[PDB]
């Protein structure tokens, strides 16, 4: 996918201390969870370095995602550092890309 590749490249760009101090809800990374990933990341407020990632994610989610609002993200227990979240998201997206899915 052209959108997928571009998002991979952006995540590589920004991870090679992203939003230092910012914690987000952990996700149970499995296929198609673009909505959940955005539902978590949309809640980061003072970090311009992830703004593009946020816009890019909206392209992959068929519904509007607004901060404070949840639907696709059903579990909110563990909170993790943004850097870790985005690194884990990256490996997940690379797998999708490798799979052709």
């Amino acid at each position: 996918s052209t959108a997928l590749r571009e998002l991979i490249e952006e995540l590589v760009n920004i991870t090679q201390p992203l939003c230092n101090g910012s914690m987000v809800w952990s996700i149970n990374l499995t296929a198609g969870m673009y909505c959940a990933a955005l539902e978590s990341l949309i809640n980061v407020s003072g970090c311009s370095a992830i703004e593009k990632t946020q816009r890019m994610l909206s392209g992959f989610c068929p519904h509007k995602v607004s901060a404070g609002q949840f639907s696709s993200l059903h579990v909110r227990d563990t909170k993790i550092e943004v850097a870790q979240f985005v690194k884990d998201l990256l490996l997940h997206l690379k797998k999708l890309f490798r799979e052709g899915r």
């Epitope: 052209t2 590749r5 991979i8 690379k94 797998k95 890309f97 490798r98 799979e99 052709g100």
Partner: antibody, heavy 121, light 108 residues
């Protein structure tokens, strides 16, 4: 040093099955980002990608040949195996295995020396 | 399926001269083109990936450039060891495809 070596040259009769093994060194087939592909080249002709497999068993096959191809790997043996059914004289070629030079994209940085497979009666 | 057309089929140049090899794709492949060099009886050798990234161990006379549908491999000043067959391969999309090669031969 990363090395790859294809199993010995083989003769296959038309309709028969080709099995090739690639033995690898200088990397592990369970290490993040490691992948191996097969690429063939008929005598005097261009390279053609066949299939590849990643460290986590994710696989891709050339769609024109998908029904004929299987790829597998075994980390303990450091081996990648390609199986190709219903061989035809047109499949006579040098078969290479090669490592992907990326953790998710498809181009090849280290190559085996190639093995000649001849399909003929 | 992305078709890659390499020009010219055979390029005849003398050592010392600048070479330009062309590779054109049937549709856009963004920047994702790899170049390989191949000598008789030998496996292909990776020279360039993602359009313009020079592989380690490849001398700096080599450069890839281009994007979209038009790509070039150039060599600033040919050395004897550079005469060989050159293949392009796109890695924008599945199925991964290669061009038919340019044979760079010594003009004498």
């Amino acid at each position: 040093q990363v090395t790859l070596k294809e199993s010995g040259p083989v003769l296959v009769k038309p309709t028969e099955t080709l099995t090739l093994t690639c033995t690898v060194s200088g990397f592990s087939l369970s290490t993040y980002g490691m992948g191996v592909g097969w690429i063939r080249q008929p005598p005097g002709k261009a390279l053609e990608w066949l299939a590849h497999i990643w460290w986590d068993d994710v696989k891709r096959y050339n769609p024109a040949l998908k029904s004929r191809l299987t790829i597998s790997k075994d980390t303990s043996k450091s081996q990648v195996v390609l199986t190709m059914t219903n061989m035809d004289p047109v499949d006579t070629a040098t078969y290479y295995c090669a490592r992907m030079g990326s953790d998710y994209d498809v181009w090849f940085d280290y190559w085996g020396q190639g093995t000649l497979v001849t399909v003929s009666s | 399926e992305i078709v890659l057309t390499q020009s010219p089929a055979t390029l005849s140049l003398s050592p010392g001269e600048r070479a330009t090899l062309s590779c054109r794709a049937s549709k856009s492949i963004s920047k994702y083109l790899a170049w390989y060099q191949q000598k008789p009886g030998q496996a292909p050798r990776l020279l360039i990936y993602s359009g313009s990234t020079l592989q380690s161990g490849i001398p700096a006379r080599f450069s890839g450039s281009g994007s979209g549908t038009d790509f070039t491999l150039t060599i600033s000043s040919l050395e004897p060891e550079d005469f060989a067959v050159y293949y392009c391969q796109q890695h924008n999309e599945y199925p991964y495809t290669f061009g038919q090669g340019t044979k760079l031969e010594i003009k004498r």
